[PDB]
Amino acid sequence: APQQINDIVHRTITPLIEQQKIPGMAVAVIYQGKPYYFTWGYADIAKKQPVTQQTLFELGDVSKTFTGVLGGDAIARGEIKLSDPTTKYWPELTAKQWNGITLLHLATYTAGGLPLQVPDEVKSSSDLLRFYQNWQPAWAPGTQRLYANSSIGLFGALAVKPSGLSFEQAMQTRVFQPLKLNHTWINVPPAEEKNYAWGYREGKAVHVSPGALDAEAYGVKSTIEDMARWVQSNLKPLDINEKTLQQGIQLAQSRYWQTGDMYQGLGWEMLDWPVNPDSIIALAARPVKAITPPTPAVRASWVHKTGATGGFGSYVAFIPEKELGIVMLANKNYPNPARVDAAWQILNALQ
């Protein structure tokens, strides 16, 4: 890579790895549209397997960007509308609190306080219906944002119903395959296990466990090369040939709600660029202001998403107007501020 990129990346990431005791890390910088890769350490400490450009990391919450784009593609296909009531796609959801809750509210965490986590005891389709029927909102819809897997997770499940495909099949056929993300998985096949890094939590090797709506909210695994391709696709959607997918990417970067200096998209979150770091813990309820109608994707934006699983920490950020982006994948869930600080240091140096 150009020495400037080599230097800012190494001078920023080496210290990060040391301070946070990260076992293994991969980084991709997209500069002027081209990807540059960097890897350090171990994918599997016990078996002494190094992190490579083919290593699979759990993306955690970054998976929501794929869910938001798949939803956008379904909107573009005319299969669903964000203005539709949740009950149009799940008629069995008869409890009264659901009146007025639309797919937009599920997708943007504004339904009225759906919880962060779907309880472990909820597994079957019947258990899930019971959970949502029993949930009591704290607030009216479209008034406060509370980040939640049970919210965008339900959005993903309902968004694919008209397609007649399972969520995984829809994601594979409509998003992964068209974009050539051939080493991106919701379920890691046996043939690919050799490349699946272990996550580390309190020194123990761990992988994410199965859970309801996991694929939709936090279950994608990918390589640094495929993630760089995902960032390229989101930086320049017009280069995408599939019409509804190009549109869906654009819809996911639209600004639907504002809380402070941040705007909520479908999966993606955005701030106006230029932006400094301090503007960029268990439950944070914030009032939201509707952007009526949503602002189409703004090129001069810091678009990003952080993600974690018990043993992994991920971060993705890009600035469309500058054709610049970064992906940071690690097999330890370390503090979010440290991720954002490093990403900003690298991208700010590059322009």
Side-chain angles (χ1 to χ4, degrees), residues 1-17 20 22-33 35-95 97-120 122-235 237-238 240-242 244-275 277-350:
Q3 196 167 28
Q4 170 183 40
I5 298 178
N6 179 84
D7 296 346
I8 189 71
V9 168
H10 279 104
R11 287 168 187 174
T12 301
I13 302 299
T14 295
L16 179 70
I17 286 167
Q20 304 298 153
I22 291 168
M25 185 150 193
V27 169
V29 168
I30 293 179
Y31 178 80
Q32 305 192 343
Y36 299 96
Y37 306 109
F38 304 84
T39 67
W40 298 258
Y42 292 83
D44 180 334
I45 295 176
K47 293 190 177 168
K48 301 175 177 198
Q49 301 292 301
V51 171
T52 74
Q53 293 169 26
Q54 291 74 213
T55 297
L56 292 165
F57 291 82
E58 293 174 1
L59 299 185
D61 307 88
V62 167
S63 298
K64 298 174 175 69
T65 65
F66 292 97
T67 301
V69 170
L70 183 63
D73 173 86
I75 295 167
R77 289 170 180 265
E79 291 178 337
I80 63 169
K81 291 178 190 166
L82 287 175
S83 57
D84 280 338
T86 297
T87 53
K88 181 175 167 165
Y89 303 96
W90 207 1
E92 293 75 11
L93 205 53
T94 60
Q97 69 272 25
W98 288 89
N99 294 318
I101 296 180
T102 66
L103 295 186
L104 171 68
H105 303 305
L106 298 178
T108 57
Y109 324 118
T110 50
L114 276 171
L116 176 63
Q117 303 129 315
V118 174
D120 289 312
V122 175
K123 301 174 182 184
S124 67
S125 57
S126 171
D127 289 337
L128 201 64
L129 171 67
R130 178 150 50 69
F131 168 68
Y132 286 112
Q133 282 280 73
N134 286 153
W135 164 73
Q136 293 308 112
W139 319 303
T143 60
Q144 299 200 48
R145 179 183 181 278
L146 180 62
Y147 186 84
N149 292 333
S150 72
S151 184
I152 192 178
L154 181 56
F155 170 70
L158 302 184
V160 302
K161 282 182 185 180
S163 79
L165 304 170
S166 68
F167 182 81
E168 175 180 34
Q169 187 62 254
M171 188 68 73
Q172 293 172 310
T173 292
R174 300 183 170 188
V175 179
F176 299 165
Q177 289 170 17
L179 302 177
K180 317 291 205 184
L181 308 184
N182 300 135
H183 295 84
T184 297
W185 315 100
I186 280 166
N187 294 113
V188 180
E192 313 298 322
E193 286 176 25
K194 63 183 185 301
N195 280 142
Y196 190 6
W198 280 95
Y200 292 87
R201 184 182 168 188
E202 297 301 337
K204 304 305 187 173
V206 300
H207 278 156
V208 66
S209 61
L213 301 177
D214 56 0
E216 299 84 351
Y218 56 82
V220 175
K221 295 88 189 184
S222 191
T223 67
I224 196 67
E225 298 185 341
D226 273 13
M227 286 309 293
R229 193 162 180 87
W230 177 233
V231 167
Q232 289 178 128
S233 303
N234 278 271
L235 272 167
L238 299 179
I240 296 169
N241 306 294
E242 292 68 22
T244 59
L245 180 55
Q246 177 181 106
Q247 194 175 345
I249 291 173
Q250 291 161 341
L251 293 172
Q253 278 177 60
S254 289
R255 297 178 176 194
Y256 297 91
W257 305 93
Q258 184 177 5
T259 171
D261 303 321
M262 163 274 177
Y263 301 90
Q264 183 63 58
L266 308 177
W268 294 112
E269 296 166 20
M270 295 77 66
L271 293 92
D272 281 314
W273 173 266
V275 359
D278 308 0
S279 175
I280 302 176
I281 214 157
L283 180 169
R286 292 285 289 279
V288 291
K289 171 195 288 192
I291 300 175
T292 306
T295 309
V298 176
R299 230 172 156 177
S301 293
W302 172 275
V303 187
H304 72 156
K305 188 71 185 80
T306 188
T309 59
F312 290 80
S314 63
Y315 187 69
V316 174
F318 60 91
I319 304 169
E321 156 194 25
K322 304 292 191 189
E323 295 180 45
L324 181 66
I326 189 174
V327 181
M328 298 158 57
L329 306 178
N331 57 355
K332 187 180 176 182
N333 172 17
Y334 64 103
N336 278 353
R339 309 178 197 183
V340 173
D341 191 0
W344 190 86
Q345 188 160 294
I346 291 166
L347 298 192
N348 188 226
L350 302 177

PDB file of all heavy atoms in Angstrom, residues 281-313:
ATOM      1  N   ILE A 281     -24.765   3.236  28.407  1.00  0.00           N
ATOM      2  CA  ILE A 281     -23.980   2.114  27.930  1.00  0.00           C
ATOM      3  C   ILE A 281     -24.967   0.894  27.789  1.00  0.00           C
ATOM      4  O   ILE A 281     -25.173   0.459  26.662  1.00  0.00           O
ATOM      5  CB  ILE A 281     -22.591   1.999  28.814  1.00  0.00           C
ATOM      6  CG1 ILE A 281     -21.390   1.507  28.000  1.00  0.00           C
ATOM      7  CG2 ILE A 281     -22.733   1.188  30.015  1.00  0.00           C
ATOM      8  CD1 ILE A 281     -20.045   1.941  28.667  1.00  0.00           C
ATOM      9  N   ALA A 282     -25.674   0.407  28.820  1.00  0.00           N
ATOM     10  CA  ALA A 282     -26.579  -0.764  28.613  1.00  0.00           C
ATOM     11  C   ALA A 282     -27.969  -0.484  27.999  1.00  0.00           C
ATOM     12  O   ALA A 282     -28.555  -1.324  27.296  1.00  0.00           O
ATOM     13  CB  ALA A 282     -26.774  -1.517  29.959  1.00  0.00           C
ATOM     14  N   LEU A 283     -28.504   0.697  28.272  1.00  0.00           N
ATOM     15  CA  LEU A 283     -29.829   1.090  27.782  1.00  0.00           C
ATOM     16  C   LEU A 283     -29.780   2.616  27.742  1.00  0.00           C
ATOM     17  O   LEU A 283     -29.488   3.254  28.751  1.00  0.00           O
ATOM     18  CB  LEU A 283     -30.905   0.617  28.779  1.00  0.00           C
ATOM     19  CG  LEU A 283     -32.398   0.889  28.527  1.00  0.00           C
ATOM     20  CD1 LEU A 283     -33.250   0.063  29.524  1.00  0.00           C
ATOM     21  CD2 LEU A 283     -32.716   2.412  28.713  1.00  0.00           C
ATOM     22  N   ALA A 284     -30.025   3.195  26.571  1.00  0.00           N
ATOM     23  CA  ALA A 284     -29.998   4.637  26.388  1.00  0.00           C
ATOM     24  C   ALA A 284     -31.238   5.089  25.606  1.00  0.00           C
ATOM     25  O   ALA A 284     -31.289   5.005  24.366  1.00  0.00           O
ATOM     26  CB  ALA A 284     -28.718   5.050  25.655  1.00  0.00           C
ATOM     27  N   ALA A 285     -32.255   5.563  26.323  1.00  0.00           N
ATOM     28  CA  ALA A 285     -33.498   6.032  25.715  1.00  0.00           C
ATOM     29  C   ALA A 285     -33.342   7.512  25.337  1.00  0.00           C
ATOM     30  O   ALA A 285     -32.948   8.335  26.167  1.00  0.00           O
ATOM     31  CB  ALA A 285     -34.660   5.861  26.691  1.00  0.00           C
ATOM     32  N   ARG A 286     -33.608   7.845  24.080  1.00  0.00           N
ATOM     33  CA  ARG A 286     -33.459   9.216  23.609  1.00  0.00           C
ATOM     34  C   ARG A 286     -34.647   9.673  22.789  1.00  0.00           C
ATOM     35  O   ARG A 286     -35.140   8.950  21.926  1.00  0.00           O
ATOM     36  CB  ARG A 286     -32.230   9.334  22.710  1.00  0.00           C
ATOM     37  CG  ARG A 286     -30.874   9.158  23.395  1.00  0.00           C
ATOM     38  CD  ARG A 286     -30.557  10.421  24.209  1.00  0.00           C
ATOM     39  NE  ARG A 286     -30.244  11.556  23.332  1.00  0.00           N
ATOM     40  CZ  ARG A 286     -29.053  11.758  22.755  1.00  0.00           C
ATOM     41  NH1 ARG A 286     -28.046  10.912  22.965  1.00  0.00           N
ATOM     42  NH2 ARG A 286     -28.877  12.798  21.934  1.00  0.00           N
ATOM     43  N   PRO A 287     -35.138  10.887  23.037  1.00  0.00           N
ATOM     44  CA  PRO A 287     -36.270  11.331  22.226  1.00  0.00           C
ATOM     45  C   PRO A 287     -35.753  11.520  20.788  1.00  0.00           C
ATOM     46  O   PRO A 287     -34.595  11.898  20.572  1.00  0.00           O
ATOM     47  CB  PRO A 287     -36.625  12.691  22.831  1.00  0.00           C
ATOM     48  CG  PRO A 287     -36.164  12.578  24.257  1.00  0.00           C
ATOM     49  CD  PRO A 287     -34.853  11.827  24.144  1.00  0.00           C
ATOM     50  N   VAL A 288     -36.624  11.267  19.824  1.00  0.00           N
ATOM     51  CA  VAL A 288     -36.292  11.430  18.413  1.00  0.00           C
ATOM     52  C   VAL A 288     -37.205  12.446  17.753  1.00  0.00           C
ATOM     53  O   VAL A 288     -38.357  12.618  18.139  1.00  0.00           O
ATOM     54  CB  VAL A 288     -36.465  10.114  17.582  1.00  0.00           C
ATOM     55  CG1 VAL A 288     -35.442   9.122  17.976  1.00  0.00           C
ATOM     56  CG2 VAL A 288     -37.867   9.536  17.770  1.00  0.00           C
ATOM     57  N   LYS A 289     -36.667  13.083  16.731  1.00  0.00           N
ATOM     58  CA  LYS A 289     -37.394  14.045  15.913  1.00  0.00           C
ATOM     59  C   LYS A 289     -37.515  13.395  14.534  1.00  0.00           C
ATOM     60  O   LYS A 289     -36.521  12.928  13.988  1.00  0.00           O
ATOM     61  CB  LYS A 289     -36.581  15.344  15.789  1.00  0.00           C
ATOM     62  CG  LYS A 289     -37.198  16.297  14.774  1.00  0.00           C
ATOM     63  CD  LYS A 289     -36.262  17.427  14.351  1.00  0.00           C
ATOM     64  CE  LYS A 289     -36.049  18.473  15.420  1.00  0.00           C
ATOM     65  NZ  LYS A 289     -35.363  19.683  14.831  1.00  0.00           N
ATOM     66  N   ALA A 290     -38.720  13.280  13.994  1.00  0.00           N
ATOM     67  CA  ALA A 290     -38.917  12.707  12.666  1.00  0.00           C
ATOM     68  C   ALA A 290     -38.404  13.649  11.597  1.00  0.00           C
ATOM     69  O   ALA A 290     -38.511  14.885  11.741  1.00  0.00           O
ATOM     70  CB  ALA A 290     -40.421  12.441  12.424  1.00  0.00           C
ATOM     71  N   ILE A 291     -37.828  13.073  10.553  1.00  0.00           N
ATOM     72  CA  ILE A 291     -37.366  13.842   9.406  1.00  0.00           C
ATOM     73  C   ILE A 291     -38.462  13.535   8.388  1.00  0.00           C
ATOM     74  O   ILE A 291     -38.572  12.419   7.828  1.00  0.00           O
ATOM     75  CB  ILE A 291     -35.996  13.381   8.955  1.00  0.00           C
ATOM     76  CG1 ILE A 291     -35.014  13.578  10.120  1.00  0.00           C
ATOM     77  CG2 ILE A 291     -35.560  14.238   7.740  1.00  0.00           C
ATOM     78  CD1 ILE A 291     -33.669  13.070   9.888  1.00  0.00           C
ATOM     79  N   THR A 292     -39.314  14.541   8.199  1.00  0.00           N
ATOM     80  CA  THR A 292     -40.520  14.399   7.403  1.00  0.00           C
ATOM     81  C   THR A 292     -40.490  15.236   6.130  1.00  0.00           C
ATOM     82  O   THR A 292     -40.655  16.459   6.235  1.00  0.00           O
ATOM     83  CB  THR A 292     -41.688  14.881   8.268  1.00  0.00           C
ATOM     84  OG1 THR A 292     -41.685  14.164   9.530  1.00  0.00           O
ATOM     85  CG2 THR A 292     -43.008  14.684   7.556  1.00  0.00           C
ATOM     86  N   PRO A 293     -40.222  14.628   4.962  1.00  0.00           N
ATOM     87  CA  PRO A 293     -39.949  13.207   4.680  1.00  0.00           C
ATOM     88  C   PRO A 293     -38.456  12.944   4.868  1.00  0.00           C
ATOM     89  O   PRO A 293     -37.656  13.877   4.979  1.00  0.00           O
ATOM     90  CB  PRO A 293     -40.376  13.053   3.216  1.00  0.00           C
ATOM     91  CG  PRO A 293     -39.914  14.399   2.615  1.00  0.00           C
ATOM     92  CD  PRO A 293     -40.296  15.414   3.697  1.00  0.00           C
ATOM     93  N   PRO A 294     -38.059  11.649   4.898  1.00  0.00           N
ATOM     94  CA  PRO A 294     -36.632  11.329   5.089  1.00  0.00           C
ATOM     95  C   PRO A 294     -35.707  11.965   4.063  1.00  0.00           C
ATOM     96  O   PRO A 294     -36.010  12.028   2.863  1.00  0.00           O
ATOM     97  CB  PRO A 294     -36.616   9.792   4.985  1.00  0.00           C
ATOM     98  CG  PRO A 294     -37.981   9.385   5.469  1.00  0.00           C
ATOM     99  CD  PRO A 294     -38.905  10.444   4.863  1.00  0.00           C
ATOM    100  N   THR A 295     -34.541  12.398   4.508  1.00  0.00           N
ATOM    101  CA  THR A 295     -33.556  12.975   3.602  1.00  0.00           C
ATOM    102  C   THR A 295     -32.847  11.882   2.842  1.00  0.00           C
ATOM    103  O   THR A 295     -32.359  10.937   3.456  1.00  0.00           O
ATOM    104  CB  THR A 295     -32.506  13.726   4.381  1.00  0.00           C
ATOM    105  OG1 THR A 295     -33.167  14.619   5.255  1.00  0.00           O
ATOM    106  CG2 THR A 295     -31.541  14.529   3.436  1.00  0.00           C
ATOM    107  N   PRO A 296     -32.783  11.965   1.510  1.00  0.00           N
ATOM    108  CA  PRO A 296     -32.088  10.910   0.784  1.00  0.00           C
ATOM    109  C   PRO A 296     -30.624  10.929   1.196  1.00  0.00           C
ATOM    110  O   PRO A 296     -30.081  11.963   1.629  1.00  0.00           O
ATOM    111  CB  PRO A 296     -32.266  11.325  -0.686  1.00  0.00           C
ATOM    112  CG  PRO A 296     -33.535  12.110  -0.668  1.00  0.00           C
ATOM    113  CD  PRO A 296     -33.379  12.942   0.576  1.00  0.00           C
ATOM    114  N   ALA A 297     -29.967   9.787   1.029  1.00  0.00           N
ATOM    115  CA  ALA A 297     -28.564   9.670   1.388  1.00  0.00           C
ATOM    116  C   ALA A 297     -27.718  10.900   1.087  1.00  0.00           C
ATOM    117  O   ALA A 297     -27.598  11.341  -0.072  1.00  0.00           O
ATOM    118  CB  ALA A 297     -27.964   8.440   0.711  1.00  0.00           C
ATOM    119  N   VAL A 298     -27.122  11.442   2.128  1.00  0.00           N
ATOM    120  CA  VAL A 298     -26.272  12.617   2.013  1.00  0.00           C
ATOM    121  C   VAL A 298     -24.839  12.155   1.813  1.00  0.00           C
ATOM    122  O   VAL A 298     -24.288  11.439   2.641  1.00  0.00           O
ATOM    123  CB  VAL A 298     -26.364  13.467   3.284  1.00  0.00           C
ATOM    124  CG1 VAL A 298     -25.399  14.660   3.207  1.00  0.00           C
ATOM    125  CG2 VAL A 298     -27.802  13.926   3.487  1.00  0.00           C
ATOM    126  N   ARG A 299     -24.234  12.580   0.708  1.00  0.00           N
ATOM    127  CA  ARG A 299     -22.858  12.230   0.383  1.00  0.00           C
ATOM    128  C   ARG A 299     -21.834  12.675   1.462  1.00  0.00           C
ATOM    129  O   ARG A 299     -20.927  11.920   1.824  1.00  0.00           O
ATOM    130  CB  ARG A 299     -22.529  12.874  -0.965  1.00  0.00           C
ATOM    131  CG  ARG A 299     -21.914  11.985  -2.016  1.00  0.00           C
ATOM    132  CD  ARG A 299     -21.849  12.782  -3.323  1.00  0.00           C
ATOM    133  NE  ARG A 299     -20.833  12.311  -4.261  1.00  0.00           N
ATOM    134  CZ  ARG A 299     -20.654  12.831  -5.479  1.00  0.00           C
ATOM    135  NH1 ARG A 299     -21.421  13.842  -5.898  1.00  0.00           N
ATOM    136  NH2 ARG A 299     -19.719  12.332  -6.291  1.00  0.00           N
ATOM    137  N   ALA A 300     -21.976  13.902   1.970  1.00  0.00           N
ATOM    138  CA  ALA A 300     -21.102  14.457   3.016  1.00  0.00           C
ATOM    139  C   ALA A 300     -21.508  13.944   4.408  1.00  0.00           C
ATOM    140  O   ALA A 300     -21.910  14.726   5.294  1.00  0.00           O
ATOM    141  CB  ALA A 300     -21.195  15.967   3.013  1.00  0.00           C
ATOM    142  N   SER A 301     -21.381  12.637   4.601  1.00  0.00           N
ATOM    143  CA  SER A 301     -21.765  12.007   5.865  1.00  0.00           C
ATOM    144  C   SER A 301     -20.699  11.062   6.349  1.00  0.00           C
ATOM    145  O   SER A 301     -19.960  10.514   5.545  1.00  0.00           O
ATOM    146  CB  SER A 301     -23.006  11.115   5.678  1.00  0.00           C
ATOM    147  OG  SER A 301     -24.213  11.794   5.357  1.00  0.00           O
ATOM    148  N   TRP A 302     -20.641  10.886   7.668  1.00  0.00           N
ATOM    149  CA  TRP A 302     -19.829   9.848   8.303  1.00  0.00           C
ATOM    150  C   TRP A 302     -20.944   8.784   8.524  1.00  0.00           C
ATOM    151  O   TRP A 302     -21.871   9.001   9.337  1.00  0.00           O
ATOM    152  CB  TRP A 302     -19.299  10.321   9.662  1.00  0.00           C
ATOM    153  CG  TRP A 302     -18.608   9.270  10.499  1.00  0.00           C
ATOM    154  CD1 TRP A 302     -19.187   8.379  11.347  1.00  0.00           C
ATOM    155  CD2 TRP A 302     -17.196   9.009  10.546  1.00  0.00           C
ATOM    156  NE1 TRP A 302     -18.229   7.581  11.920  1.00  0.00           N
ATOM    157  CE2 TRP A 302     -17.000   7.938  11.446  1.00  0.00           C
ATOM    158  CE3 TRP A 302     -16.081   9.580   9.906  1.00  0.00           C
ATOM    159  CZ2 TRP A 302     -15.733   7.421  11.734  1.00  0.00           C
ATOM    160  CZ3 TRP A 302     -14.826   9.067  10.190  1.00  0.00           C
ATOM    161  CH2 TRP A 302     -14.657   8.001  11.094  1.00  0.00           C
ATOM    162  N   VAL A 303     -20.881   7.690   7.780  1.00  0.00           N
ATOM    163  CA  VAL A 303     -21.887   6.619   7.858  1.00  0.00           C
ATOM    164  C   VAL A 303     -21.165   5.500   8.604  1.00  0.00           C
ATOM    165  O   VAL A 303     -20.038   5.148   8.258  1.00  0.00           O
ATOM    166  CB  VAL A 303     -22.288   6.125   6.442  1.00  0.00           C
ATOM    167  CG1 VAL A 303     -23.433   5.148   6.533  1.00  0.00           C
ATOM    168  CG2 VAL A 303     -22.740   7.323   5.530  1.00  0.00           C
ATOM    169  N   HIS A 304     -21.801   4.936   9.627  1.00  0.00           N
ATOM    170  CA  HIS A 304     -21.106   3.933  10.400  1.00  0.00           C
ATOM    171  C   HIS A 304     -22.013   2.980  11.139  1.00  0.00           C
ATOM    172  O   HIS A 304     -23.221   3.167  11.217  1.00  0.00           O
ATOM    173  CB  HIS A 304     -20.144   4.619  11.393  1.00  0.00           C
ATOM    174  CG  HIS A 304     -20.803   5.308  12.552  1.00  0.00           C
ATOM    175  ND1 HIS A 304     -20.139   5.542  13.737  1.00  0.00           N
ATOM    176  CD2 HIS A 304     -22.057   5.789  12.714  1.00  0.00           C
ATOM    177  CE1 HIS A 304     -20.969   6.128  14.589  1.00  0.00           C
ATOM    178  NE2 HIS A 304     -22.139   6.284  13.997  1.00  0.00           N
ATOM    179  N   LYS A 305     -21.380   1.941  11.671  1.00  0.00           N
ATOM    180  CA  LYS A 305     -22.043   0.964  12.515  1.00  0.00           C
ATOM    181  C   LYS A 305     -21.031   0.216  13.332  1.00  0.00           C
ATOM    182  O   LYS A 305     -20.005  -0.255  12.809  1.00  0.00           O
ATOM    183  CB  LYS A 305     -22.823  -0.061  11.707  1.00  0.00           C
ATOM    184  CG  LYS A 305     -23.721  -1.020  12.602  1.00  0.00           C
ATOM    185  CD  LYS A 305     -24.944  -0.234  13.188  1.00  0.00           C
ATOM    186  CE  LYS A 305     -25.765  -1.117  14.160  1.00  0.00           C
ATOM    187  NZ  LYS A 305     -25.075  -1.130  15.484  1.00  0.00           N
ATOM    188  N   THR A 306     -21.286   0.096  14.639  1.00  0.00           N
ATOM    189  CA  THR A 306     -20.427  -0.687  15.513  1.00  0.00           C
ATOM    190  C   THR A 306     -21.121  -2.018  15.803  1.00  0.00           C
ATOM    191  O   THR A 306     -22.346  -2.130  15.707  1.00  0.00           O
ATOM    192  CB  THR A 306     -20.202   0.030  16.812  1.00  0.00           C
ATOM    193  OG1 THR A 306     -19.203  -0.663  17.585  1.00  0.00           O
ATOM    194  CG2 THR A 306     -21.529   0.151  17.540  1.00  0.00           C
ATOM    195  N   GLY A 307     -20.337  -3.042  16.128  1.00  0.00           N
ATOM    196  CA  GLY A 307     -20.981  -4.316  16.426  1.00  0.00           C
ATOM    197  C   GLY A 307     -20.140  -5.137  17.385  1.00  0.00           C
ATOM    198  O   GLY A 307     -18.924  -4.949  17.504  1.00  0.00           O
ATOM    199  N   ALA A 308     -20.814  -6.010  18.124  1.00  0.00           N
ATOM    200  CA  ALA A 308     -20.126  -6.890  19.039  1.00  0.00           C
ATOM    201  C   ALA A 308     -20.869  -8.168  19.252  1.00  0.00           C
ATOM    202  O   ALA A 308     -22.070  -8.249  19.046  1.00  0.00           O
ATOM    203  CB  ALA A 308     -19.911  -6.184  20.427  1.00  0.00           C
ATOM    204  N   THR A 309     -20.108  -9.190  19.617  1.00  0.00           N
ATOM    205  CA  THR A 309     -20.706 -10.450  20.101  1.00  0.00           C
ATOM    206  C   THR A 309     -19.885 -10.689  21.378  1.00  0.00           C
ATOM    207  O   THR A 309     -18.974  -9.922  21.720  1.00  0.00           O
ATOM    208  CB  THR A 309     -20.555 -11.664  19.161  1.00  0.00           C
ATOM    209  OG1 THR A 309     -19.163 -11.909  18.931  1.00  0.00           O
ATOM    210  CG2 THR A 309     -21.294 -11.467  17.857  1.00  0.00           C
ATOM    211  N   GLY A 310     -20.165 -11.769  22.106  1.00  0.00           N
ATOM    212  CA  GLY A 310     -19.401 -11.950  23.316  1.00  0.00           C
ATOM    213  C   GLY A 310     -17.885 -11.948  23.135  1.00  0.00           C
ATOM    214  O   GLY A 310     -17.160 -11.466  23.974  1.00  0.00           O
ATOM    215  N   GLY A 311     -17.439 -12.471  21.998  1.00  0.00           N
ATOM    216  CA  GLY A 311     -16.010 -12.551  21.770  1.00  0.00           C
ATOM    217  C   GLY A 311     -15.438 -11.730  20.618  1.00  0.00           C
ATOM    218  O   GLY A 311     -14.247 -11.860  20.322  1.00  0.00           O
ATOM    219  N   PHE A 312     -16.249 -10.848  20.025  1.00  0.00           N
ATOM    220  CA  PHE A 312     -15.790 -10.084  18.854  1.00  0.00           C
ATOM    221  C   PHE A 312     -16.212  -8.635  18.912  1.00  0.00           C
ATOM    222  O   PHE A 312     -17.245  -8.310  19.521  1.00  0.00           O
ATOM    223  CB  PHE A 312     -16.365 -10.638  17.528  1.00  0.00           C
ATOM    224  CG  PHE A 312     -15.815 -11.979  17.112  1.00  0.00           C
ATOM    225  CD1 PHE A 312     -16.295 -13.147  17.695  1.00  0.00           C
ATOM    226  CD2 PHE A 312     -14.832 -12.047  16.120  1.00  0.00           C
ATOM    227  CE1 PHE A 312     -15.804 -14.427  17.290  1.00  0.00           C
ATOM    228  CE2 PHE A 312     -14.332 -13.293  15.717  1.00  0.00           C
ATOM    229  CZ  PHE A 312     -14.818 -14.472  16.298  1.00  0.00           C
ATOM    230  N   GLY A 313     -15.426  -7.783  18.262  1.00  0.00           N
ATOM    231  CA  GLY A 313     -15.742  -6.350  18.190  1.00  0.00           C
ATOM    232  C   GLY A 313     -15.485  -5.896  16.768  1.00  0.00           C
ATOM    233  O   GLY A 313     -14.357  -6.093  16.268  1.00  0.00           O
TER     234      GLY A 313
END
